[PDB]
C-alpha cells in the first residue's frame, strides 16, 4: 500500500480532489447568486437580459454539472475510504 | 441517500436548468 505521511495516499488524493472541487463550486455558486439578483432587478424593471449574460450563466450551469459529476464518485470514494 | 441529491446538485430545478443551458448553448 502506497502511503504519504502515514495515510494511504489514495485517500489523501480523493480528499485533495474533494477540497479542490468544492472551492471551484463555491466560486461558481457565488457568480450564479449575483447573476440572479441582477436578473431579478432587470426583470422587475422589464429590462432585457443581454445575450452575453445568458451565455455566461448557461456556461456556469454546465460547468457546475460537470463538477457535480466529479464531486460524486470523489465523495463516494472519500466515504468508502472512511474506515476511520 | 438523498443527502447526495443536495450535495451533488441533483434537485429537480437544477436538472431543469442544466437542460435549458444545453439548449441555449446548442449542446447535446
Amino acid at each position: 500500500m502506497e502511503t504519504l505521511g502515514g495515510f494511504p495516499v489514495e485517500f489523501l488524493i480523493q480528499v485533495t480532489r474533494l477540497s479542490k472541487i468544492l472551492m471551484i463550486k463555491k466560486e461558481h455558486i457565488k457568480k450564479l447568486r449575483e447573476m440572479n439578483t441582477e436578473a431579478e432587478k432587470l426583470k422587475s424593471y422589464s429590462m432585457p437580459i443581454s445575450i452575453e449574460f445568458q451565455r455566461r450563466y448557461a456556461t456556469i450551469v454546465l460547468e457546475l454539472e460537470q463538477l457535480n459529476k466529479d464531486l460524486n464518485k470523489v465523495l463516494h470514494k472519500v466515504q468508502q475510504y472512511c474506515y476511520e | 441517500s438523498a443527502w447526495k441529491t443536495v450535495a451533488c446538485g441533483g434537485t429537480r430545478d437544477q436538472l431543469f436548468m442544466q437542460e435549458k443551458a444545453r439548449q441555449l448553448l446548442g449542446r447535446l
Partner: protein
C-alpha cells in the same frame, strides 16, 4: 502545482486533523449544495435561460 501542495499539506496532518478536515469538507459539500439548489430555483423562475424569441 497547488494540487500536489494540497496533497502534501494533507499528508502532514495528524489523523485527528485529517478527519476533521474530511468532515468539514463533507459539511461544506452539503451547505454549498443547499446554496446551489436555491439559486437554481431562483434562476428558473426568472427565466434567465429562455431563448430570445423577439
Amino acid at each position: 502545482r497547488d494540487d500536489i501542495d494540497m496533497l502534501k499539506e494533507l499528508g502532514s496532518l495528524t489523523t485527528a486533523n485529517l478527519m476533521e478536515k474530511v468532515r468539514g469538507l463533507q459539511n461544506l459539500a452539503y451547505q454549498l449544495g443547499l446554496d446551489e439548489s436555491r439559486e437554481m430555483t431562483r434562476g428558473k423562475f426568472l427565466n434567465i435561460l429562455e431563448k430570445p424569441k423577439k
